[PDB]
Design a protein around this ligand. Structure first.
Ligand code: HEM
Ligand SMILES: CCOc1ccccc1O
Length: 403
């Protein structure tokens, strides 16, 4: 409908999944708020518009269409008002910085060592499958109370939920172009229910220190628990992004450091630079790239576009983090970029609740990897491909080292 953006009609879902950055560079210049036909929604592409929409009093959270088809209600990302306040109060205790600092080292560091011990003398490894994902999922799984769910299963679940949640393509009539793409999300949920329903059965009667037990019990009247149907969608929110994103952020940070060998050596030699390297990694390839959205609650004008009430806007934070109004040469990883605000954790009342936790998981994992393999090098016989529009990260990271 917007004439000068007719080229957007030829943008495909596969193009955005393989590399959304060329399309979004055009969007940031041509239309910071733009309706993308294959996505069926307005998208915010610049830092200014994403931040404005994420923090505006005239917008509230909305789950994307494929996200809602995947998670249902009440996903913490998709609700507001009293339900959102309750779900935030439910998840926040274990994520409080003073609480994280009590146990994060004893949680993540032995896990990192366990996975490293399997390959650190091999001289070769694919770090996404052998290290970044296992550490991410084993750390969160143990915190949640899923100690008995193997890391290969947690990784399979977040991969299936990822593809279902981002199964966003719509056809010429605005209907989902790929309805079969939700089936593997439904199968993952069915498997999760089979595993987790007995655990909830047990936690209701015998609460323990697992996070999901506290989600059932915290803040409830005596002898009452939150209904499992009320907390399952937020369990799914965790079993997708909370399981997936720390591993993605680790791996993207490593790919960026390998792209700047001098900076990789700097960080190996001085591990106090790991937090800075990670912050730049998150900006450089944002793990949550375009997964969340807001919806207008009254008529509003954003970036010159008059939106009616009830208009969804997708928040493409991964594009906003390449906003050249903010950053010079943003497609280059640069550890020595000044530490500027970024949107990799979102903004507003629905901003990431687990920032402090996630930053420490990533930090500890990279600390242990560099201590165990200080001569780590990328395997240049291998290419690194990144995949994902909703969630983005490298699909493999082949490395080598002299042993
Ligand atoms: C590096 C890994 C992570 C990245 C890049 C990250 C980035 C985000 C982003 C972009 C959002 C959406 C914010 C918005 O719409 O404005 C988010 C929502 C959230 N994240 Fe994180 N996240 C990360 C790891 C976690 C972890 C490990 C947890 C849990 C332990 C976590 C708990 C949340 C929760 C509960 C929400 C929903 C917040 C709400 O809607 O009220 N995140 N995260
Ligand atoms: C823990 C955050 O997980 C998500 C965030 C935004 C969209 C989907 C998610 O699973």
């Amino acid at each position: 409908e917007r004439p000068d953006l007719a080229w957007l009609d030829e943008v495909t879902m596969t193009q955005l999944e393989r590399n959304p950055y060329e399309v979004y560079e055009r969007l940031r210049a041509e239309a910071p708020l733009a309706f993308v036909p294959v996505l069926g929604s307005y998208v915010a592409s610049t830092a200014e518009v994403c931040r404005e929409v994420a923090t505006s009093p005239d917008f509230e959270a909305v789950i994307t269409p494929a996200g809602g088809r995947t998670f249902g209600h009440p996903a913490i990302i998709g609700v507001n008002g009293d339900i959102h306040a309750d779900l935030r109060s439910m998840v926040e205790p274990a994520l409080q910085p003073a609480e994280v600092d009590r146990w994060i080292d004893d949680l993540v560091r032995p896990i990192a060592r366990r996975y490293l011990e399997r390959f650190e003398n091999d001289g070769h490894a694919e770090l996404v499958a052998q290290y970044c994902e296992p550490v991410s999922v084993r750390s969160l799984g143990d915190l949640l109370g899923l100690q008995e769910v193997d890391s290969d299963k947690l990784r399979e679940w977040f991969a299936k939920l990822n593809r279902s949640f981002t199964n966003a393509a719509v056809d010429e009539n605005g209907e989902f172009a790929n309805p079969e793409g939700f089936a593997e999300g439904d199968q993952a949920k069915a498997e999760i229910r089979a595993v987790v329903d007995p655990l909830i059965d047990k936690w209701i009667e015998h609460p323990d220190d697992s996070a999901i037990s506290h989600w059932l019990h915290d803040g409830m009247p005596p002898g009452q628990t939150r209904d499992r149907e009320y907390i399952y969608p937020t369990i799914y929110v965790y079993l997708l992004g909370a399981m997936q994103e720390p591993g993605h952020g680790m791996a993207s940070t490593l790919v960026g450091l390998f792209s700047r060998p001098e900076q990789l050596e700097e960080v190996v030699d001085d591990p106090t630079l790991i937090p800075r390297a990670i912050a730049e990694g998150l900006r450089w390839t944002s793990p949550i790239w375009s997964a969340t959205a807001r919806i207008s609650t009254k008529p509003v004008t954003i970036a010159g576009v008059d939106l009616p009430a009830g208009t969804p806007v997708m928040l493409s934070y991964g594009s906003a983090n390449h906003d050249t109004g903010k950053y010079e040469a943003p497609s280059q990883y640069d550890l020595h970029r000044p530490p500027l605000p970024h949107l990799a954790f979102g903004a507003g009342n629905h901003a990431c609740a687990g920032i402090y936790f996630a930053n420490h998981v990533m930090r500890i994992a990279l600390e242990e990897l560099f201590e165990a393999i200080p001569n780590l090098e990328r395997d240049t016989r291998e290419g690194v491909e990144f995949w994902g529009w909703g969630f983005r990260g490298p699909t493999s990271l082949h490395v080598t080292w002299e042993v």
